[PDB]
Write a protein that binds this ligand. Structure first.
Ligand SMILES: *[C@@H]1O[C@H](CO)[C@@H](O[C@@H]2O[C@H](CO)[C@@H](O)[C@H](O)[C@H]2NC(C)=O)[C@H](O)[C@H]1NC(C)=O
Lengths: 49, 48
């Protein structure tokens, strides 16, 4: 073997062709951004999520 | 669970276009015609 797959056909793991080390591949990162606010009249500052 | 499967099965469908992998139409054809076949994958995946 040389490489592996997830529950899809996407490649998740690889044998390193230079040293035979078994590697795993994460997603890099992503996600949603949510902004929390007390409202514009009372303040003008936010926290993020 | 079957909805999340059915969404994720059709990543592998070509929708009649060249290949379900973008890089294989990127690296292998002309960037004009690469724009053609990825735009068929983009709309086809966007309908799912
Ligand atoms: C690439 O191959 C060389 C040899 O073909 C590897 O060097 C060996 O590494 C192991 C592990 O440290 C040692 O037991 C051997 O004595 C080394 N041999 C020689 C001739 O140096 C090298 O490790 C390989 N590359 C990688 C990234 O592992």
């Amino acid at each position: 073997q040389q490489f592996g797959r997830d529950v899809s056909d996407f490649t998740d793991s690889v044998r390193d062709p230079k040293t035979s080390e078994i590697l795993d591949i994460s997603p890099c990162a992503f996600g949603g951004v949510s902004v929390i606010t007390p409202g514009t009249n009372a303040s003008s500052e936010v926290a993020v999520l | 669970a079957q909805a999340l499967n059915t969404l994720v099965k059709q990543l592998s469908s070509n929708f009649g276009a060249i290949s379900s992998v973008l890089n294989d139409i990127l690296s292998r054809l002309d960037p004009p015609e690469a724009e053609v076949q990825i735009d068929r994958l983009i709309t086809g995946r966007l309908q799912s």
